[PDB]
Amino acid sequence: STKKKPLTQEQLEDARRLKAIYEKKKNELGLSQESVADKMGMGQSGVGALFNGINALNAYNAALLAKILKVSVEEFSPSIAREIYEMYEAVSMQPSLRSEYEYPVFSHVQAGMFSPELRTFTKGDAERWVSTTKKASDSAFWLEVEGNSMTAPTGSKPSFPDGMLILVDPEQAVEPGDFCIARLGGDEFTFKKLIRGSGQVFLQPLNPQYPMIPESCSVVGKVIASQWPEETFG
Amino acid sequence: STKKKPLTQEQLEDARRLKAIYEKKKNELGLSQESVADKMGMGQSGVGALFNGINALNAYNAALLAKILKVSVEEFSPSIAREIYEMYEAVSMQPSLRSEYEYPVFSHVQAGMFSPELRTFTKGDAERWVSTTKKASDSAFWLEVEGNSMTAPTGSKPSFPDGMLILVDPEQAVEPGDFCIARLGGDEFTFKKLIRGSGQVFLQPLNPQYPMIPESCSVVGKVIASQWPEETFG
DNA sequence: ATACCACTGGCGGTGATAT
DNA sequence: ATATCACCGCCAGTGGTAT
């Protein structure tokens, strides 16, 4: 493992998405590996290594490549986009957001969760989808809903059955009448409704087949929408 | 040296710049150093030393320590201020082939009927944000569904309950397995999923508590996605 | 609580290799 | 000119040890 390469799976997913796009474009502008190499500050050396997934990319070089590919980043890597994007705020302060945004779904779990940092892309990949005209994301993310926590008793107010999508966003304002998630036992998540009952904090789900946690809960972030998957077609 | 640490003027005193500003604000937000150690994601021995010119910033965490130390890189490293800035143009790119914001909300009825070309419009208003994987490059639209005609049995794959929104784009394949709006006599609708069952093809209420039915009937437009409304939250 | 050290791991690179 | 494999220099970053 100092002898051979590991490289994560979505670490491939990006270099792939890239690969296919390199074919079509050299055509357009008359381009090859060593040519790339030379238009930046290096050799062919890897380059393919990347497309192929032998070496993994430095966002920065990726930031070259796209320019060279006459195209954006999401088209090949979005996670990068977020990264880059982020690093900008650093300069002049403001999220223009423009059109798309991004942010992931992850392997349904707390990923340590915020307050402390997130280890970037982290153990989870889930390829991350995005697109409904999107708002302030901060440290957001989509999540698939597994546990039937709230599943409206068959035509009630709202819903949230299996496989559907909720959206985390943790840099949020969490109040009564609102949907959200909180923390339990140091480990547990559960995605629920927030209520001041007889004047206290409760978590009820739209799913009576279920109970209701009351002191020791701490909210975590305010779920903003649902979308469903896409898989719904294929 | 190279058995030691390679020294280059600015390629050093940038961090100075940093720590210099650091101590002035260091206690004014609420931070030690073990605080930079954490939050960032790397040891204190690790955090603390860079600043001594002992380590050169990568473009990365560069951008971190500003959404912390309430600055703007160039405020301490324009050398990298530069570096980050010309990667956003990598991400800036252009109004691509995927959306600004699309179709409306509508009280069901006649969707125009693509028996000719589909003619629409008997009010005009809507109030509809929100986008998708751009499709609907002809005639498509949102839809709000009252009727349990899909609400899955309690614990179940797909669902679609009440007044949860959904997207049609007839300009499209549209076949058994995909979810589809349809009507009869050129009048009705309750719409269902389509199936390949022997002796003709039919539409299955995704509430098997519902009667299910099929020559005289027609298959106008196609569902591809469905999300909860914006404000069904906040 | 921060400044300082002897160490290393697995990415970011060249350079010659079989299809 | 596309995939490819046997090796090194390398600096961000770390675990003890101090202050």
UniProtKB/Swiss-Prot annotation, chains A, B:
Name of the protein: Repressor protein cI
Species per Swiss-Prot/TrEMBL record: Escherichia phage lambda (Bacteriophage lambda)
Domain HTH cro/C1-type: 18-76
Job of this protein: Acts as a transcriptional repressor that allows virus to establish and maintain latency. Prevents both the viral DNA replication and the exit programs. Clamps the two operator OL (operator left made of OL1, OL2 and OL3 sites) and OR (operator right made of OR1, OR2 and OR3 sites) together by binding to them and arranging the intervening DNA in a loop. This step allows repression of lytic pR and pL promoters by binding to OL1, OL2, OR1 and OR2 simultaneously.
UniProt GO MF annotations: core promoter sequence-specific DNA binding; identical protein binding
Keywords, alphabetical: DNA-binding, Latency-replication decision, Repressor, Transcription, Transcription regulation, Viral latency, Viral latency initiation and maintenance
Subunit record text: Homooctamer. The DNA loop is maintained by octamers of repressor cI.
Miscellaneous note of the record: Bacterial cells harboring a lysogenic lambda phage are immune to further infection by lambda. The cI repressor protein inhibits the lytic development of any additional infecting phage particles. The region of the genome that codes for the cI repressor protein is known as the immunity region.
Keyword DNA repair: no
UniProt-listed GO biological process terms: latency-replication decision; maintenance of viral latency; negative regulation of transcription by competitive promoter binding; positive regulation of viral transcription
DNA-binding region(s), chain positions: 29-48
SUPFAM superfamilies: lambda repressor-like DNA-binding domains (SSF47413), LexA/Signal peptidase (SSF51306)
Cited PANTHER family: LEXA REPRESSOR, LEXA REPRESSOR-RELATED
Transmembrane stretches, start-end: none
Coiled-coil annotated spans: none
